[PDB]
Ligand binder design. Structure first.
Ligand SMILES: Nc1ncnc2c1ncn2[C@@H]1O[C@H](COP(=O)(O)OP(=O)(O)O)[C@@H](O)[C@H]1O
Ligand SMILES: Nc1ncnc2c1ncn2[C@@H]1O[C@H](COP(=O)(O)OP(=O)(O)O)[C@@H](O)[C@H]1O
Ligand SMILES: [Mg+2]
Ligand SMILES: [Mg+2]
Lengths: 23, 567, 542, 123, 65
């Protein structure tokens, strides 16, 4: 008869940048 | 037990970790000297350093040195693997660390070795989770707080020290960072001597030549070389010995040895672990394959080998070597062939790059790739970098309309500052190959980046004879034919076109061979290519380079040569 | 037990793997010899290599080979997959790895197989997650460390070795990188024989032809093909008989025809007669193509690798793609058709990736014939562009040059080019060694177009006589595509006439001469005389 | 059932699937009907969870492997068959795909459901 | 100028190693005039007149500003 705890991580979205060719 | 008796004697030691003495000296100082003679330290009135960070490329001897220290020092040793401490329960990783340090402090004046701290100690500002922040803070306060470190010394090992918390890289926590780096020639020789102390080597093997020929090997590759040579030798001796269903015969074990051929085969087969990403598929070419261009071949051999073979003379004369060359001319003249010949018959490492091979759509990733390849080349020196079709990757930045995204300019600037910038002046020779020099940045053709611009011309009569003889060296031929008429008839062809003529001769000989062979089975007629095949293969022979491109290449050549005037 | 006997027989082992003898030789050398005779290793004084990284395309038999060697040897086998071992919470993936290695070393001298390792080692630099870095570090520490492991072997399987941390490909972790590549014709034959050891075949059954026509099917593909063909046979010969709620004397007449395998390869993942005229071009191309492959021994004797490239230029709809398809059918080499503007991209440095990918696939699936259709679109004149699109075109043509003729191993790969405007190509591709042959395809003559019509009517239901000579001589300006259009129009006119005639009834099984005439009554010419003059001038100046 | 088998508790999901399969293989040659398989098929490539990919690998292990199945056939049920693993849709595990997609059948269902034309054309 | 010096040193190295090989079959303790004379036959001026004119035009514009 004893409780407990637990810490867990979580995923996070990340942006980005991209160069583009052109005419 | 019998195994334990040998295993106990097999424990590593300082003698086993040779290859880097200065770093060994520092580690020995910190670990032993305050434990052997503390009185001198109390006499001088200061306490010694009590923290180390061993860093460098992988497989250099970090874990090995930690093991050697553990075996030698009589003090208590405590090893902590990196991702060994933390668990799912909140507040348990810190409990494990506290217990570890408490045991070390309570037991004796001990040593703590923490392996791969780049995983347990990341930068707090960058990490998003909470447990890693708590554990790194715990490590900080535990290693440097109030009433801490009563005669305990910590050693750390990592492959990437930059990804460490800055709060850890200061005095008191990690006093000074020992750089366990790539060994030099004598270091490689010492590593070979160490690994070939228990092996039954043959009487004809010398290790100086091997140490000289192996260049970028980190010392963990030397063990690989030794093991592969042993594997080749045992394979050869087993192809002779029986299947050996029972225990191996006593008569073969009494006669075992490893000759220089095994080591040479391993050297030709193996490749440094650092460059395993950029390995080149085995292509075989030799200097006898490249006909004509004898002066260029000799000059290239000199400029690539003299800084490698004779560094003592260079340092005695007090000047650097030259580290650049550019090939320009009509296509197919043999520039890529020269690159292949170099990569085959030069001892220095080779890095091959296509034209756009390193260009990515992401932002800055092309420059990241450029930095990566040049860092690899500088680390594994001496090195040869071949930039095939330079005009794709290096154009006149800002000329006419630049790149819409402004990426070509950035990559060429990065290339500029990698070939000539704040660096350590390692042996990196850059080979350039292009066939449109007018669209090259003038800042790349400067001496110190690409010093000598060699022009490969269309072969003359003698060069045509040489290349024809080189191409026909291994084919079977009758004594009747002579290739001087073949060379004279062309007067404007290139090495590629002569190869094409030889190929059509081969195809016609093949057709005749099959036609003459089919009747033999229906109910060795042409063991060699006859004069008729050569006579008939030229019917479809046409010049490769036109008269408009040739004049342009020549005109550029005299344009370059004119500035050398007034001499 | 009934199933126990099959358990021993089903136990994978030697002779089950076919086409990887050299790689199997190396792996067994690594796994068995030190465990078979360790006294010699103790005598010679060097530890064996104890790590392998098997790589190659998926479903080639990596797990099969690992299981075979493990079951043959007395060592314990433990399998670890990529996703199964990693979790979302903090601090259990490394625990799983530690428990696996601990129990493996505790139980017996074991062989460990980490399937799909590339999902566990993201190189620690192109990756932002924390659990992945931590598990990579744990794996490194387990593999090497203070008394890390002893008398245990590790094997990995991956498709993209470059996406692995370099610290893992060091001696002591992953010693020798074995390449488990696509198998050749002999490998395919032997794997077919291996898979057909238990099944019952028919009298007229051969596996050499099957190995011939099959090109890219590897391993599990072959297994699935055979299994589903047999299942279809069983299902086909069960409904034509009464569904009994059955005599073995009638059941043991199953066999396997060829048509079953034919449609099996036709549904799972032209001919030389279809091309009219162009006889000299056909025979020249035939020799240049299948001489390397049909007689490799004599070429090795002579010591000369053959030519690879060819370029056709001429009017459109003439049959360049038709010849390419005929080649693809007439030799076992793979076909890779790519259009001109298909490879382009508004992004920066992506057409180059496309070209690298297609050429890497071609070299991996050798022998191969690559058909560059409308090469003038990619290989523009590298000098007179003058634009950002010009810079992109320069980049892509340079990549094409360095890929088709560069630092490469000279695998069997044949490049075929096709253009209708041959004078907008940089004269660096046209040099011998890249695309040496410049074949011109002209408009066909009367006999050629008559033969084209006959070939097009190879399977078309026709009257006993059609008198194709009249239509052949009355179409002096047409092309093969236009003739195909005329034939299709005639067929559709016959079809609709039959439909209209049968609608009232609910009539001619073959296309009538009148139907053909009224179909020829409408026609179009797709080529003018100016284009012919331009091609003639180009040929003359060449 | 798909969402029923869910046992986040110390990843008991794989234990539940193992118990189910062992019970189907223990008594007799039986028929396993796993309903709503699209919820437990995260394609292991677009998902970012843990149990999902772990239970996908458990299903791929229980369906194919050493002494995987001994005279037992499994049946599935889904709405979108495109969100399944290419390793789950392979031969030996899920080698047959049946399309159960008319007016006369709807009228037959209406007749057999009201046993104890506008209704077949409007619905 | 560094390129000229490098080439002179290269010819000196060539002569030294050739003389040593002859010895087996300090001969050149210092670089001679002939070494420079031979190494200066391939001397090139990297900076072109167009770039020089551009740079001086920019400098004069800066001054006039
Ligand atoms: N080279 C091969 N020879 C025989 N069978 C093969 C081969 N490659 C694959 N298979 C068959 O395919 C099935 C799955 O192969 P698998 O071991 O998953 O391959 P991989 O490790 O290349 O992904 C096995 O049951 C095996 O019988
Ligand atoms: N000589 C020919 N014999 C038979 N069909 C032909 C011939 N030339 C062209 N065709 C027909 O024209 C169609 C398209 O030809 P294609 O090969 O795409 O031409 P292109 O060489 O212009 O790319 C094909 O469906 C083919 O049946
Ligand atoms: Mg180590
Ligand atoms: Mg080249």
């Amino acid at each position: 008869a004893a409780a407990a705890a637990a810490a867990a991580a979580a995923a996070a979205a990340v942006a980005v940048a991209v160069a583009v060719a052109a005419a | 037990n019998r195994e334990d008796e040998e295993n106990n004697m097999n424990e590593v030691g300082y003698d086993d970790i040779g290859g880097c003495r200065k770093q060994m000296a520092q580690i020995r100082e910190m670990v032993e000297l305050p434990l052997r003679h503390p009185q001198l330290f109390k006499a001088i009135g200061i306490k010694p350093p009590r923290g180390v960070l061993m860093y460098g490329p992988p497989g250099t001897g970090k874990t090995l040195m930690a093991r050697a220290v553990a075996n030698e020092t009589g003090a208590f040793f405590f090893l902590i693997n990196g991702p060994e401490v933390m668990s799912k329960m909140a507040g348990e990783s810190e409990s494990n660390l506290r217990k570890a340090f408490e045991e070390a402090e309570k037991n004796a004046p001990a040593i703590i070795f923490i392996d791969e701290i780049d995983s347990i100690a990341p930068k707090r500002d960058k990490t998003n989770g909470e447990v890693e922040r708590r554990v790194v803070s715990q490590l900080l306060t535990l290693m440097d707080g109030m009433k801490a470190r009563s005669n305990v010394v910590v050693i750390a090992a990592t492959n990437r020290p930059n990804s460490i918390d800055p709060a850890l890289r200061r005095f008191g926590r990690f006093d000074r960072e020992v750089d366990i780096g790539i060994p030099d020639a004598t270091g490689r020789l010492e590593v070979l001597r160490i690994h070939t102390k228990n092996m039954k080597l043959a009487d004809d093997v010398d290790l100086e030549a091997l140490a000289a020929e192996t260049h970028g090997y980190v010392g963990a590759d030397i063990a690989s070389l030794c093991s592969e040579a042993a594997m080749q030798q045992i394979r050869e001796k087993m192809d002779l010995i029986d299947l050996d269903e029972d225990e191996i015969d006593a008569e073969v074990l009494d006669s075992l040895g490893v000759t220089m051929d095994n080591f040479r085969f391993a050297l030709g087969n193996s490749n440094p672990s650092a460059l395993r990403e950029t390995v080149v598929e085995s292509v075989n070419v030799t200097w006898d394959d490249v006909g004509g261009l004898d002066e260029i071949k000799e000059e290239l051999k000199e400029t690539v080998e003299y800084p490698v073979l004779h560094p003592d003379q260079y340092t005695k004369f007090g000047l650097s070597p030259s580290k650049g060359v550019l090939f320009y001319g009509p296509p197919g003249t043999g520039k890529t062939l020269l690159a292949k010949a170099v990569a085959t018959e030069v001892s220095a490492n080779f890095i091959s790059v296509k034209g756009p091979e390193l260009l990515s759509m992401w932002y800055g990733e092309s420059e990241s790739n450029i930095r990566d390849i040049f860092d690899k080349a500088r680390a594994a020196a001496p090195t040869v970098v071949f930039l095939d079709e330079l005009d794709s990757i290096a154009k006149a930045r800002g000329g006419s309309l630049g790149d819409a995204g402004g990426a070509s300019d950035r990559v060429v600037n990065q290339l500029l500052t990698e070939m000539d910038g704040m660096n350590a002046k390692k042996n990196v020779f850059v080979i350039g190959a292009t066939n449109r020099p007018d669209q090259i940045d003038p800042a790349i053709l400067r001496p110190g980046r690409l010093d000598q611009l060699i022009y490969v011309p269309l072969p003359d009569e003698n060069a045509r004879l040489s290349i024809l003889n080189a191409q026909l060296r291994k084919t079977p031929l009758e004594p009747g034919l002579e290739l001087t008429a073949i060379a004279k008839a062309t007067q404007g062809f290139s090495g590629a076109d002569l190869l094409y003529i030889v190929q059509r001769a081969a195809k016609y000989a093949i057709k005749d061979s099959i036609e003459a062979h089919r009747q033999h089975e229906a109910e060795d007629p042409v063991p060699y290519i006859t004069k008729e095949h050569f006579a008939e293969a030229m019917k479809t022979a046409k010049r490769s380079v036109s008269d408009a491109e040739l004049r342009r290449y020549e005109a550029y050549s005299q344009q370059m040569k004119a500035s050398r005037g007034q001499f």
